[PDB]
Amino acid sequence: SIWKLQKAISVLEMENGYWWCRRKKQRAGVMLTVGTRPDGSPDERWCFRVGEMNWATWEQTLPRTLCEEPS
Amino acid sequence: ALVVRMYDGLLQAGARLCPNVQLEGIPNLEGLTPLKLAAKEGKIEIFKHILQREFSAPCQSLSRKFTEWCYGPVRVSLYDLASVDSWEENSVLEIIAFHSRSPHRHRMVVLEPLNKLLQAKWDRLIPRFCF
Amino acid sequence: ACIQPLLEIDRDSGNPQPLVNAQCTDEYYRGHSALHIAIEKRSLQCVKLLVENGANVHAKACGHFFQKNQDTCFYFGELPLSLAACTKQWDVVNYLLENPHQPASLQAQDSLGNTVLHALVMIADDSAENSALVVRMYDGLLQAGARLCPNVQLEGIPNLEGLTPLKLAAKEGKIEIFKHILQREFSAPCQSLSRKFTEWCYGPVRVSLYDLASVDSWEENSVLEIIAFHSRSPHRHRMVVLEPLNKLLQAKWDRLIPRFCFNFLCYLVYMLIFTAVAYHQPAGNSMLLLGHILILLGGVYLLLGQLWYFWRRRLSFMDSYSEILFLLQALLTVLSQVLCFLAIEWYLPLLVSSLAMGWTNLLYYTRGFQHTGIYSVMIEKVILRDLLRFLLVYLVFLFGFAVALVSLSRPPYRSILDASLELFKFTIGMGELAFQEQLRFRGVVLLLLLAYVLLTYVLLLNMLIALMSETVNSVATDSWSIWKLQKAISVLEMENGYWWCRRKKQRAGVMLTVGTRPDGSPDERWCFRVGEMNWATWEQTLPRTLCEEPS
Amino acid sequence: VMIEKVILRDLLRFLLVYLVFLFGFAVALVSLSRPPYRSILDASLELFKFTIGMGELAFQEQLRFRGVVLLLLLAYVLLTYVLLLNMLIALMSETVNSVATDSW
Numbered sequence: 001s002i003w004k005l006q007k008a009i010s011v012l013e014m015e016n017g018y019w020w021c022r023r024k025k026q027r028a029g030v031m032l033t034v035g036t037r038p039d040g041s042p043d044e045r046w047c048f049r050v051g052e053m054n055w056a057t058w059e060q061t062l063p064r065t066l067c068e069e070p071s
Numbered sequence: 072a073l074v075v076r077m078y079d080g081l082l083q084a085g086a087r088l089c090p091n092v093q094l095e096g097i098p099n100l101e102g103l104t105p106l107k108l109a110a111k112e113g114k115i116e117i118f119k120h121i122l123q124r125e126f127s128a129p130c131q132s133l134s135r136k137f138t139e140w141c142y143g144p145v146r147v148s149l150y151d152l153a154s155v156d157s158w159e160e161n162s163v164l165e166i167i168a169f170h171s172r173s174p175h176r177h178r179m180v181v182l183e184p185l186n187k188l189l190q191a192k193w194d195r196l197i198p199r200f201c202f
Numbered sequence: 203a204c205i206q207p208l209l210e211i212d213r214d215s216g217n218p219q220p221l222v223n224a225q226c227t228d229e230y231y232r233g234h235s236a237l238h239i240a241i242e243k244r245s246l247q248c249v250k251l252l253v254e255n256g257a258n259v260h261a262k263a264c265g266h267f268f269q270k271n272q273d274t275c276f277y278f279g280e281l282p283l284s285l286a287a288c289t290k291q292w293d294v295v296n297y298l299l300e301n302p303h304q305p306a307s308l309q310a311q312d313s314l315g316n317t318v319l320h321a322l323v324m325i326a327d328d329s330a331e332n333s334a335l336v337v338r339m340y341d342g343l344l345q346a347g348a349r350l351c352p353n354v355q356l357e358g359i360p361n362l363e364g365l366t367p368l369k370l371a372a373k374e375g376k377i378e379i380f381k382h383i384l385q386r387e388f389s390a391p392c393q394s395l396s397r398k399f400t401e402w403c404y405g406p407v408r409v410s411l412y413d414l415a416s417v418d419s420w421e422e423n424s425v426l427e428i429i430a431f432h433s434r435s436p437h438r439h440r441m442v443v444l445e446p447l448n449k450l451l452q453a454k455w456d457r458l459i460p461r462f463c464f465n466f467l468c469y470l471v472y473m474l475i476f477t478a479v480a481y482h483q484p485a486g487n488s489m490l491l492l493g494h495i496l497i498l499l500g501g502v503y504l505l506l507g508q509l510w511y512f513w514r515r516r517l518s519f520m521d522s523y524s525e526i527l528f529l530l531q532a533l534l535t536v537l538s539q540v541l542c543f544l545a546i547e548w549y550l551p552l553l554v555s556s557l558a559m560g561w562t563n564l565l566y567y568t569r570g571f572q573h574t575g576i577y578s579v580m581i582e583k584v585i586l587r588d589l590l591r592f593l594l595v596y597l598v599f600l601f602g603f604a605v606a607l608v609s610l611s612r613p614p615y616r617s618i619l620d621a622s623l624e625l626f627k628f629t630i631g632m633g634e635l636a637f638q639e640q641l642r643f644r645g646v647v648l649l650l651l652l653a654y655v656l657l658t659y660v661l662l663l664n665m666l667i668a669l670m671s672e673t674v675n676s677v678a679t680d681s682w683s684i685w686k687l688q689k690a691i692s693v694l695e696m697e698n699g700y701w702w703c704r705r706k707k708q709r710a711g712v713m714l715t716v717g718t719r720p721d722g723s724p725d726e727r728w729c730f731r732v733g734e735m736n737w738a739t740w741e742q743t744l745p746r747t748l749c750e751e752p753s
Numbered sequence: 754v755m756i757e758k759v760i761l762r763d764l765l766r767f768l769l770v771y772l773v774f775l776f777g778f779a780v781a782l783v784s785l786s787r788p789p790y791r792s793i794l795d796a797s798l799e800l801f802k803f804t805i806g807m808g809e810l811a812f813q814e815q816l817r818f819r820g821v822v823l824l825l826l827l828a829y830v831l832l833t834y835v836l837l838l839n840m841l842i843a844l845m846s847e848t849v850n851s852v853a854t855d856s857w
């Protein structure tokens with residue numbers, strides 16, 4: 001964990017930029033419409049994907065998705 | 072357990088009363104939304120609850136964890152990055168790394184939306200570190 | 203509801219290519235099909251409907267989502283039956299086998315060559331429920347294949363690399379199913395699939411048999427050579443301690459101790475003659491030229507032998523750690539005697555270094571005894587863990603303080619390595635002659651010495667706590683398994699024989715008649731015996747024996 | 754009791770391996786010595802003085818070579834450090850998986 005923390009501080013400091021060049025950073029993640037908000041417009045948010053594997057899915061239940069087709 | 076129960080139910084009642092208000096966005100006098108305050112004070116389990124939070128059909132929009140698609144044993148889960156990404160000034164990662172004072176700052180980084188995110192940024196920016 | 207009228211519109215239109223038999227076209231889901239969706243959506247009824255309309259039960263999903271090593275991809279093979287097998291839907295498999303239209307065949311292979319059993323091995327990784335599901339599905343599919351086709355034996359069908367599911371099951375490091383395959387007994391309706399029997403059980407003592415059809419090293423490409431020279435998983439040392447392997451390796455190791463001791467003694471004679479040649483280097487020229495010829499032939503012999511070994515079985519450090527040293531040592535000795543016959547005036551340090559390296563390389567043969575065998579495994583674990591990184595950090599410290607002392611020194615401390623020797627001789631306690639008096643400031647060198655001593659103390663203490671941390675959190679039943687694996691490596695090497703002498707190696711185990719085949723002739727197998735003592739025999743019923751009188 | 758357990762567990766392996774190291778390096782040094790390194794006993798005495806810390810080292814400088822001698826002595830000291838660490842970690846592994854009833 002301490003190794004992950006020091007790597008985090010390092011990658012954030014390198015993402016900030018050096019002293020003679022303050023750089024306009026980049027957003028990360030996918031922006032899409034997730035759902036519909038109760039006041040008019042649909043819900044439009046930025047997202048991050050995590051792909052995960054589990055084997056207890058059959059006896060448990062499947063929830064509702066955002067896109068039916070995997071893409 | 073009582074805190075996550077009261078928090079979720081109180082957010083549902085706030086959804087039912089006034090829809091125009093966004094309750095998790097209101098800052099304190101320090102300028103802090105409550106997720107950021109939960110990160111700054113070093114409170115663990117409630118922070119883990121807020122980062123991965125799902126709700127039922129009458130209030131979908133409150134929820135943060137979305138499934139893009141599930142196909143058998145493999146699943147693709149979406150996490151929101153509305154306050155996590157360091158693109159905006161004063162992000163939760165920036166609070167953990169710099170502005171905090173808690174002695175458990177290493178414990179909160181192995182969580183689900185931070186782990187693969189820092190993995191992706193570090194593997195994106197190896198070559199300038201080598202340079 | 204709309205599907206059967208939609209397929210009815212597809213049929214009534216008179217289409218040459220039907221709708222249900224249609225493939226996705228992209229790279230990512232190449233060759234995906236409707237039936238795979240019907241299976242993955244847990245629907246028996248839609249599978250029944252699609253089978254009634256004429257769906258292809260061999261729709262080969264050969265896409266980029268279906269390869270093994272791409273990120274977030276699900277490998278199951280490409281067959282629909284494979285998918286229904288992997289996703290633990292039993293009745294779907296039974297319907298796909300026993301439908302009246304377009305029946306499934308278990309002998310079918312994917313584009314990668316795997317059948318249903320191979321992919322079913324591929325998807326098992328680790329749990330209680332995963333392994334129980336995989337083993338139960340495996341046995342049920344074997345029984346259904348037995349009743350469906352009595353023609354072929356299903357476990358004989360090889361992969362594109364040439365693997366049956368036992369061999370690939372060991373190659374990928376899947377352990378629990380592999381243990382299940384090596385000791386597998388079935389019931390009376392189909393007992394001819396089993397591999398374990400009981401010869402006789404005289405109360406609490408019993409003699410189990412095991413089949414060795416692909417486990418003995420007599421046959422080409424056995425499980426032994428796959429565990430030793432092909433398996434890359436870090437759990438191989440758990441895959442050696444199994445039940446019908448241990449008896450076989452003990453029998454072969456006690457069968458061929460004497461060739462090991464003989465070759466050890468010959469190597470000791472080689473090093474003693476090399477010791478005499480190196481000491482009496484300096485009539486006696488007859489003995490010296492005999493030493494030339496003897497060490498030349500020995501170095502040629504071992505150099506060619508280890509070159510042949512390096513060519514034969516290699517496809518990555520600590521496992522092959524032993525042979526590299528003998529190859530380099532033999533190359534050093536042959537090069538030294540080559541330059542000596544050339545008289546190139548470089549042969550004396552090569553000779554002394556070869557003598558040193560050869561006497562240090564004698565610890566290969568400490569694996570015969572367990573008391574030094576565990577010691578040699580600990581030496582290798584020291585060599586893997588901390589030594590390289592610690593030496594790199596030490597070179598950083600050494601070079602930094604040595605260049606500091608050189609640049610501080612304006613007749614001691616003349617050059618870089620000529621001061622680096624002073625810096626290293628200072629760490630053991632032979633450092634001397636401070637206050638060099640060639641410049642005003644010497645407290646500089648005083649503080650440099652203090653800093654170097656304290657930081658080297660810190661680095662040795664860090665190496666100590668790293669060794670303790672790595673050694674304390676590991677099971678005591680690990681080094682013994684590593685020793686058994688290393689003995690297995692050595693005994694298979696000696697069973698290979700010499701390189702100048704191709705041996706006619708022999709089969710192991712007793713051939714007997716284990717039973718009858720369901721087609722005619724009696725089943726005769728080669729088998730390995732194993733005795734066992736079980737004082738819980740009176741709880742259960744007695745198993746089916748071959749010969750009642752204990753032989 | 755721990756004296757007897759340590760001598761019984763360490764000597765008959767460790768001194769044998771260490772003796773192979775000392776004998777090989779001593780014959781190597783006598784060979785590479787073409788008044789220092791006079792006899793085999795004195796050479797083994799010098800090589801054990803480097804285990805006590807009294808060995809006097811210098812460049813040969815009119816001989817076969819000097820840095821070969823230096824690198825061999827480096828290899829000797831570092832490998833004996835390796836073996837002492839090995840004896841320590843083996844004794845700690847035997848000490849870790851033990852019970853408080855046994856020595857009593």
Ligand SMILES: C=C(C)[C@]12C[C@@H](C)[C@@]34O[C@](Cc5ccccc5)(O[C@@H]1[C@@H]3C=C(COC(=O)Cc1ccc(O)c(OC)c1)C[C@]1(O)C(=O)C(C)=C[C@@H]41)O2
Pocket residue numbers: 523524527555558559562563564565566578581582585589827828831832835
């Ligand atoms: C492959 C490795 C790791 C190695 C190759 C050579 C260069 C080696 O330096 C090392 C690096 C080193 C140097 C000095 C001290 C420690 C380590 O150690 C061995 C290697 C270190 C020694 C001792 O070898 C061992 O580690 C014990 C050993 C040898 C052979 C085995 O089959 C074995 O397994 C049981 C164990 C042998 C040397 O060849 C030697 O005596 C001289 C002349 C150089 C030694 O590199």
